[PDB]
Design a protein around this nucleic acid. Structure first.
Lengths: 427, 306, 335, 76, 335
DNA sequence: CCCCCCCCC
DNA sequence: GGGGGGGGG
């Protein structure tokens, strides 16, 4: 409201900076105190700040995370909210926006001179309006106030020509009718800082650590937690993260990338089940994916029926995943030897061996090539269904009610699809 | 934007050092925009001479290996780096952390045009395969399968089937070819409905938080894990406008002074990896460009999926 | 006025695969398709302090206290098996066409001038000397690096794969062909003709390069060490890590490319080393010194602006160096 | 340094210090009275909170095993 | 002023392999290529209190309380079978040569001066005493560290492998050749000449060294032992882990190297202990005390900075020590 | 290109 | 408190 309290606050700020640099320098002689107070104690420091606001730039998307010998145009722009559904971005950052600072590592003090809360609001939004308390609290003269306001508000607007350096990325995009756009991307350091802050609360917050301790104590808690596995660290600055930006000095490197990985990103090995009796209960069932699927079926089998059919839809989808993995198992059985099924052995699951090794029809001209064609083995999934019958809960309440009927119906449908898949293996 | 008249199966392609950092927020499998741009570069280089159009790519990703390591004492991971050459004064240059990944993917390409009636299917298939064998897919060289046991040619299958059963058998055989992999599809509808579910759970929740909730493992107190419909990776869903579309000669140090440049920001969506037998047709897996250049929104998606 | 393009980038021509390392016996190199791969294992080392002291910890008490604390590391080691004296290193090389064609260029006039300069280079002498030196660096197994140092016999087999078959098989004695002399041979000239046709062509030329080194039985092979930054973490890590693809030791593609590009015998410093890798500002990481400095008129950038803009065509050796940089690639262009 | 006492638990270091990697290390030992449960090599740059958090998982596992081992009987 | 280089990295000459240990019988050691390898099995130990107390638990009540409830461990143990008395240890040594040339050097003039220094050494006194002591350390089985301390009879067979065939065979009684006296023998002089030809670069020398030691039926053998960071309870109190490559006990290559480097008999202290391993600041971890400290001007770094930088040539035995350090290799050089 | 101040270890 | 590095002269 009053200009006098803003003047008192900025004089207190420059006095705090003066006593801080006096304590840091610790000078007792050589006239260092007079030279320190001759440039950071009066309005001329604000004039000195006029030499510092033109060097700094307040941005939300910068180019300096891309190769640091590139000099482009870092721009502060909030992207428009897309009309298409189901996709995010930096447009989702509304009032939860932190604006990055780029420039020198010594002018950055004036950033807090643009980020104080004197009247209860940020001073950049105070200087974007022609307020009555504005242009009098910092300058007695009108024209000095106007040029100081223009220089102090120019930290948001992009300086120089619109430019992207050669070391920056530029990627052509095909237009629908006969065109291209060059589309240079910038690093969303505000969005990355927001995601890194959310991950900090998720992994090292007090409530998250309390929920982790409650999980470790196996007790109840009013809220849950998360883990965020397989995170990747991408440090931008090698020696001086402060040279990248101020937000990259807050989080020193550590881009904290999310694991967008395919399910076969941790392919262990391919193994041939030689001296074993059944593939589904001894080798295929011990893989961790179908292990989590079978524990999920065990959890979903003994449950209430209030969301039943919807849960059953999920259950149907769940059971589909398991037979998918069975095909996936057969898929990596295409990566093995052509004739592993013809090796000697007392028990090697010969009922499943017509589907386990499809390439032995190349090995044997008529000993076993015509056997898979004439037999058309599709009953093996029924054996797998028997293994899937070990994935259900041993509850008599499901058998008494129609839950077992729905389970048998979706099981019959999915193994009908599995048997139809296994039928046309000869093509 | 159109139904493909044929589907061309580029086989197992071993991409050597692909860009593992797909996005400023995600790492791992590369962007689908890289695959769509590769198919458009294939159409730009050899598609026009064959009188065909190549739009829409379905990714299977038969193998993934990340050049990463886990340091001791941390549950996160770091990227293995390459030693860049020294500067002119003999000192080590500043390191830009770039991650690499060895991929093995097979691509379904949507082919439409009169040239399908002008050439044999194996001829245009072999031409686009030998063009693609000297290109890059996500920043990595493509290993063109020299001196192994049995090389894999393409199989261009015409989607204009004479009968529904023959078309079904063709699609099931083409799915059987690309079996040890996972189709990566776009899930804008699932992410939007999960955003609505979270907004009913708690208001003023952004799409970023709904995307994050569909990727972290949520632990619920009675201690169980909140399940997910699929793999539900966070993918780069395209590019949104960050600047007005400047003139082709306006932007300093552009790639070319004939293409207009516009500064963009990455768009993040939800993708899903599925077993490819769980789709009605293999043309649903095709990743299509969608520009909408008046409003930014330079997206890639899988239209006609469900 | 023919200003330089502000972005100017070239593809990696001669892009190799990762050099897969396996083990076997000499005179069984014909049936090397079933050779078991070299696996990278872990082991522990307890060394003692042997680095230079900076005259503050040279007192006997502090030095004895430092020895009394045991220095321990974990190292990734790759060894041959104790019944396999031969290391086989196999990779695939794609000689790409359009060697002088840049990936990106701002000015159309600069692109036309650069294409005309490269076209005059092919019309004058072609890629014949450069592909001769590339075929030399394929012919001796410089890509084996430290696997080449103490080997009894190194033999390189290079197979041209046209469609799906070996179109032409070259066999070279890698130890007879020196690491520093680029002589003339008939098989080497045929390989040079194939690589130069691949560089001058529109598609690509595919080669399978296999090198058998008789290092010794059970000896230590040297794959590429992975560059992992410790990043100032509190927990101690393994000091040495190696590179593998799938339980199979390998060399990085950039190391094989650096060995293939070690053709530069025209730098203004004395050639006591011999050839160095073709780099802008002639950087050698094994020396810590950069030859072909821009204060002399023999760095790649000033040679390109003299050859292209001001039409000051340099000597034939420096033209070979410039086109070897163009085949090498790189990201150029002033702001 | 010195022992960390967490109830009946004592995290006591070995007096000898090793140099695993390049950084100095100490072999920290976790006892429940006379019985040790986890001997782990930890850096000397670790604070007491980090040494506590290294053994906190085994501490919580032993607490869970003690709860499920000496649970009282249930009448229905 | 000829300052020393910041990097002076040297490669390792006399490259050893992981010495695999198998088991067998004496007088059947001629046919020992089929001998089964020693397996690293597991056993459990109950550890009583046998260490010094810290003057706080010395009370009888707490001591008896700790003794009443002792601590159990699982140890990896390597033993011979109960019908096999002879331990066989096999490794291949690779004598490279070019010991004066460093792999990396920041200063070219310092590299030239070091090359001239090593060349003047070789012209004056070549690798004759050094190779004699290396052949001594191969002849007695010092690479059997605790497999030699109570062995009844040790025999070392060294075969020069040329083109996959044995060029020359040496058979030494390793107990007659002491661990401290460097005497002369005609076969040992022939092996010294072979290692001299390997180190001078005049030939490629690979040796297969097989040591047979009579320890006893079922006796515990001592391979290399790994560091264990975490014992825990998921791993059943794993206190000792021995080294093995594929179901086969083995010694580390650097332990064989340290046993081969034990040639240094010229440290300023008394030679009543005998030779010590060649290292900068002559450090012995078992003794815990540095022979050749930097204070007494006889360590490797001051002798190298006198011999090369200031042309102050040391004594013949001390320059033997310096060249033995150059053969050993390291990361010599400041920061 | 050299010197000084700021920031990081 | 010391040493590196950015920024100004």
């Amino acid at each position: 409201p009053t200009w006098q309290e803003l003047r008192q606050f900025i004089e207190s700020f420059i006095q705090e900076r003066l006593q801080g640099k006096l304590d840091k320098l610790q000078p007792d002689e050589d006239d260092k105190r007079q030279t320190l107070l001759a440039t950071h104690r009066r309005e001329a420091w604000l004039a000195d700040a006029a030499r510092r606001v033109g060097q700094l730039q307040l941005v939300t998307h910068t180019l300096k995370p891309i190769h640091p010998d590139a000099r482009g145009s870092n721009l502060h722009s909030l992207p428009q909210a897309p009309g298409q559904p189901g996709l995010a971005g930096s447009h989702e950052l509304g009032d939860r926006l932190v604006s990055d600072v780029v420039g020198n590592a010594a002018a950055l003090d004036v950033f807090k001179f643009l980020s104080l809360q004197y009247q209860g609001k940020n001073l950049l939004n105070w200087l974007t309006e022609d307020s009555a308390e504005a242009l009098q609290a910092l300058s007695d003269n009108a024209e000095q106030a106007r040029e100081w306001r223009q220089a102090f508000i120019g930290i948001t607007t992009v300086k120089g020509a619109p430019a992207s350096h050669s070391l920056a990325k530029q990627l052509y995009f095909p237009l629908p009718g006969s065109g291209y756009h060059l589309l240079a991307p910038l690093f969303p350091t505000s969005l990355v800082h927001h995601v890194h802050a959310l991950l900090r609360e998720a992994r090292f917050g007090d409530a998250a650590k309390a929920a982790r301790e409650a999980r470790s104590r196996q007790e109840s808690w009013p809220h849950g937690f998360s883990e965020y596995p397989n995170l990747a660290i991408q440090k931008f600055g090698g020696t001086k993260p402060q040279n990248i930006s101020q937000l990259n000095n807050e989080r020193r490197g550590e881009n904290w990338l999310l694991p967008s990985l395919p399910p076969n990103w941790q392919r262990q090995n391919v193994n041939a089940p030689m001296r074993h009796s059944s593939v589904f209960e001894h080798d295929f069932g011990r893989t961790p994916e179908v292990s989590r699927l079978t524990r999920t079926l065990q959890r979903f089998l003994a449950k209430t029926v209030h969301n039943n059919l919807a849960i059953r839809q999920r259950r149907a989808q769940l059971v589909a995943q398991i037979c998918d993995e069975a095909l996936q198992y057969a898929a990596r059985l295409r990566e093995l030897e052509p004739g592993w099924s013809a090796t000697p052995g007392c028990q090697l699951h010969d009922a499943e061996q017509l589907w386990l090794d499809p390439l032995r029809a190349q090995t044997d001209e008529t000993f076993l090539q015509r056997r898979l064609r004439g037999d058309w083995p599709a009953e093996v999934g029924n054996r797998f269904a028997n293994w899937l019958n070990r994935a259900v809960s041993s509850d008599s309440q499901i058998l008494g009610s129609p839950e077992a009927a729905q389970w048998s119906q979706e099981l019959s449908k999915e193994l009908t699809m599995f048997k139809e898949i296994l039928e046309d293996e000869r093509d | 934007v159109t139904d493909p008249e044929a589907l061309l199966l580029l086989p197992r392609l071993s991409i050597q050092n692909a860009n593992a950092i797909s996005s400023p927020l995600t790492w791992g499998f590369p962007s689908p925009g890289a695959f769509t741009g590769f198919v458009h570069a294939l159409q730009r280089r050899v598609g026009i001479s064959l009188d065909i159009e190549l739009d829409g790519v379905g990714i299977v990703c038969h193998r993934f290996e990340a050049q990463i390591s886990q340091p001791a004492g941390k549950r996160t991971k770091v990227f293995n780096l390459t030693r860049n050459p020294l500067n002119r004064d003999g000192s080590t240059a500043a390191i830009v952390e770039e991650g690499r990944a060895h991929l093995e993917v097979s691509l379904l390409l949507g082919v439409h045009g009169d040239g399908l009636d002008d050439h044999p299917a194996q001829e245009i298939a072999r031409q686009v395969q030998e063009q693609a064998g000297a290109m890059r897919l996500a920043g990595g060289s493509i290993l063109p399968w020299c001196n192994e046991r049995f090389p894999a040619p393409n199989a261009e299958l015409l989607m204009l089937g004479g009968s529904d059963e023959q078309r079904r058998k063709n699609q099931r055989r083409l799915t059987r070819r690309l079996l040890p992999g996972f189709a990566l599809v776009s899930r804008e509808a699932l992410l939007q409905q999960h955003l609505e579910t979270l907004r009913t759970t708690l208001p003023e929740a952004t799409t970023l938080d709904a995307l994050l909730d569909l990727c972290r493992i949520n632990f619920e107190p009675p201690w169980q894990v909140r399940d997910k419909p699929g793999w539900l990776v966070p993918i780069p869903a395209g590019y949104n406008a960050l600047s007005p579309l400047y003139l082709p000669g306006e932007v300093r140090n552009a790639r070319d002074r004939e293409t207009p440049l516009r500064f963009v920001e990455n768009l993040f969506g939800l993708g899903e990896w599925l077993s490819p037998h769980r789709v009605a047709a293999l043309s649903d897996l095709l990743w299509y460009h969608h520009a909408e250049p008046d409003k930014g929104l330079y997206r890639w998606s899988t239209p006609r999926f469900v | 006025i023919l200003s330089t393009a502000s972005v100017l980038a070239f593809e990696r021509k001669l892009d190799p695969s990762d050099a897969l390392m396996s083990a076997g016996a000499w005179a069984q190199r014909d049936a090397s398709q079933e050779w078991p791969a070299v696996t990278v294992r872990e082991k522990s080392v307890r060394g003692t302090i042997s680095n230079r002291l900076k005259t503050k910890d040279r007192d006997p008490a502090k030095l004895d206290a430092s020895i009394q604390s045991p220095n321990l590391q974990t190292v990734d080691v790759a060894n041959l098996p104790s019944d396999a004296d031969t290391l086989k290193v196999r990779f695939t090389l794609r000689v790409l066409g359009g060697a002088g064609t840049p990936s990106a260029c701002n000015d159309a006039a600069y692109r036309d001038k650069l294409l005309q300069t490269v076209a005059t280079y092919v019309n004058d002498q072609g890629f014949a000397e450069l592909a001769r030196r590339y075929a030399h660096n394929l012919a001796n197994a410089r890509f084996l690096w430290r696997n080449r140092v103490g080997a009894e016999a190194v033999e390189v087999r290079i197979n041209h794969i046209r469609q799906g078959e070996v179109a032409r098989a070259w066999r070279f004695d890698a130890l007879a062909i020196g690491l520093r002399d680029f002589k003339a041979d008939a098989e080497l000239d045929a390989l040079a003709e194939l690589i130069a046709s691949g560089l001058s062509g529109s598609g690509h030329v595919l080669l399978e390069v296999v090198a058998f080194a008789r290092i010794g039985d059970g000896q230590e092979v040297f794959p590429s060490q992975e560059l992992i930054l410790d990043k100032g973490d509190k927990k101690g890590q393994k000091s040495k890590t190696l590179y593998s693809v799938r339980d199979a030791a390998a060399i990085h593609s950039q190391k094989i490319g650096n060995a293939l590009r070690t053709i530069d015998t025209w730098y203004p410093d004395e050639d006591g080393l011999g050839p160095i890798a073709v780099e802008p500002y002639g950087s050698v990481t094994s020396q810590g010194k950069a030859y072909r400095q821009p204060k002399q008129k023999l760095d790649f950038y000033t040679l390109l602006d003299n050859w292209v803009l001001r039409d000051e065509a340099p000597a034939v050796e420096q033209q070979h160096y410039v086109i070897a940089n163009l085949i090498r690639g790189g990201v150029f262009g002033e702001a | 340094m010195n022992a960390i006492h967490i109830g009946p638990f004592s995290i006591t270091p070995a007096a000898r210090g090793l140099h695993y990697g390049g950084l100095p290390h100490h072999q920290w030992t976790l006892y429940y009275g006379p019985r040790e449960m986890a001997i782990k090599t930890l850096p000397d740059s670790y604070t007491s909170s980090e040494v506590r958090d290294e053994f906190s998982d085994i501490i919580a596992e032993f607490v869970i095993d003690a709860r499920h081992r000496y649970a009282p009987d249930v009448l229905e």
